[PDB]
Assembly symmetry: D2
Homo-oligomer: 208 residues x 4
């Protein structure tokens, strides 16, 4: 089929063109499989400085062997000092989590997002229906940071004095800016005050 | 810390610069977390046309919920027609699989590569030690295609008449070309003749 | 050694001297399901793990549910908790135990969910209250899997149960969440929590 | 219903009327480990799954091994196969069964590994030969996990066993792979396969 022939052609000419014209990783990036812009473009860094895992809806699920293997290898073997969870606006995973459809094996993966919805129902309830998905994309990032900070791998690193920070941002495609959701942890105590403040701030609604 | 401030700065100016100057996915790409060049650069395609999963040593393990969820969502929900496994030269995963070190949780993930080594030991044995890792990177791609073609998700798609092809390439950083290892499957019967021919071809060695 | 050498002797002298239920229990529990229920061998198809969990994304537990439901054609799935559960007590403590703590974070989330109720309770009875609440929550999880909802969708007969076995008196006690469809899952789950919230002196 | 309503009655009238081993068995098997070994309740810490597997990357089975080895401090791990195994027969057939076939591909790889041996054998005895070979291979897998090799490394006492329970005569039969260290794992694994390769008339 033509699409495969086109990759071979696109590849051959790209390599030829790069030649005509003319590394330790420092971050573990946990992003979404349906994110559109690659992390190296968005952050403008050189090849090799990101070690990358991508899964549906940028989740850190307590018992995933694939993501947890990557986090252990990055922290214990490669000695990386910053883990970043990046969500994004118009996320297909989040919309699929709020819809009522049965999609098969993938719905099982998305049930973790539905539990987060009910945790903040009284707030989201006194919000007009059409604004809820944007608030939930924000709250999901805050809860995944809270999850990463509770793993045995991260808590044990903090306990033995290893320097490690956790960050939770949203990539806003409408202006290309990364927006800080306010949960930033360098320890167990900072994880709690920071998580609690962020939710209280997120809970004062526009009177409209 | 400065590295985080530098991402914020790099992001703000990239977004400003893109503005100063100025989508259905078609492939599922299964590549390696330590690959250096992103798939969208290497293949020269526009944002959104690849749905992407990245794990250590580009594996399709029979029972991984993360990778299998992605493959089911791509095939059954998004209707993608081509799955590509891309290995690469100087792969850190493959070298870590051949070394004798205990690295922790990650070694468990790499035990699947060691089983492939023993399957082709008589060939690899009559090869000089220093050339074995390159032959194994090639043979791993051939065996992962063989694995993807045996999953319940792929065999059931073929059985119900859905068009789907599987490909196994190696990205050679030394010339930027993608090299076909010779296993290409559009059905169960083509998977077997093709896999068997490829191994027999890979087994005639340089007399030197 | 000795402990093993003995094992063979026991067996050697012991040798001289279609299942209808899928049972999901705890690796701790000491009385086998077969014993406390008094069933014939081969009647039960069995999975056991730490704190009797149905985690949304576990390939081991999910495979067993699909094989049971789709290939063997079983009509009842039972989740059984128990008092003095090691998994539960481990989840309420603050110790770090390694890889297993990750498996146990699912229980700690359930604790926060019912904090006001548990917080106007006496300290010495809170763990028993959590063991009861856990069972209610795992049945709620089993009823939300794609494998179980698809069987209901297509009209297959399947029922879900959540009980607590008390070692003290040996009696199974029904916790009140019982589902034969998605709507019965909601109503019984909600009624169950409200009853738990009426507290006695 | 009826089947359940009965279950409670049995239990209700039944109620009237530190573990030292980790046991990994098959979800099929019908005689509990506790019965065929004749041990006291609480002595065994139990995990059961389809075809008694130790897959390199299973979080459920690995969690249990770590909790058992690192927190409870158990010194023996036993893998038990059995004759007339449903998982094994399912792996040798060509049918598609759904999600479970993915779990079973690990057995089919083992079959190809010993094809010449099995190919100059009579068709009617090949499955029994594969059941024996599977047990040998899963012990070999358990002995290569990071959790088990790290315990050996640091000097902790731990032994691995691989047996086959024959329903016909009720006797456990040792398949010959027995490991107390990594070197004893290699030698006994190799000797075991060579014996299997001497065939009788
Ligand atoms: Zn997304
Ligand atoms: Zn690699
Ligand atoms: Zn328990
Ligand atoms: Zn069996």
């Amino acid at each position: 089929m033509d699409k495969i022939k086109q990759l071979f052609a696109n590849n051959y000419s790209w390599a030829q063109r790069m030649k005509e014209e003319n590394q330790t990783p420092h971050y573990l990036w946990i992003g979404c499989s349906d994110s559109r812009v690659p992390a190296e473009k968005l952050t403008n860094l050189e090849p090799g400085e990101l070690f990358v895992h991508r899964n549906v809806a940028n989740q850190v699920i307590h018992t995933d062997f694939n993501c947890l293997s990557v986090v252990q290898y990055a922290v214990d073997v490669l000695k990386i000092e910053h883990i970043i969870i990046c969500g994004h606006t118009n996320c297909g995973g989040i919309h699929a989590a709020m819809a009522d459809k049965d999609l098969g094996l993938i719905n099982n993966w998305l049930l973790h997002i539905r539990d987060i919805w009910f945790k903040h129902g009284h707030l989201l309830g006194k919000l007009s229906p059409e604004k809820r998905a944007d608030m939930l994309t924000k709250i999901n990032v805050a809860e995944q940071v809270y999850n990463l900070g509770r793993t045995s791998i991260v808590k044990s690193a903090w306990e033995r004095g290893q320097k490690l920070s956790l960050h939770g941002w949203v990539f806003d495609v409408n202006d290309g800016f990364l927006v800080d959701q306010g949960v930033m942890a360098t320890s167990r105590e900072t994880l709690e005050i920071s998580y609690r403040n962020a939710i209280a701030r997120l809970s004062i609604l526009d009177e409209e």
